[PDB]
Symmetry: C2
Subunit: 68 residues, 2 copies
């Protein structure tokens, strides 16, 4: 199965992990670079949407703190 990254899907769950998978398989870990950029783009960058962005920021930890 090809390691084609999907940046932030909103679950990224085992069969959809290829994101976190590619990022751990390469030279340095990378999903958190997105996570911190993303949380601050909502907090102080003032991005605004329905549960889409909520789900990206909360799924980041839902894999990073637990699965990874």
């Amino acid at each position: 199965g090809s390691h084609m990254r999907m940046s932030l899907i909103g679950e990224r769950f085992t069969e959809e992990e290829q994101k976190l998978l590619l990022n751990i398989l390469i030279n340095h870990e990378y999903a958190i670079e997105l996570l911190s950029s993303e949380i601050n783009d909502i907090e102080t960058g003032t991005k605004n949407v329905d549960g889409t962005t909520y789900k990206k920021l909360v799924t980041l930890y839902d894999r990073f703190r637990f699965e990874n």
Copy 2:
């Protein structure tokens, strides 16, 4: 001088950096583990205080994305 850690001060600027400093000096980086734990403590833990928790979340990126 000493490396003795301060976990989350809410600034951790170059002179107060001994936190981020100790965390990069040991086996692997660790301030980032706090970042994902912290952001989810706001997002789903529903922390609320008079800029203290705001400052912890926004300071994490203010050194992670930029400095370290």
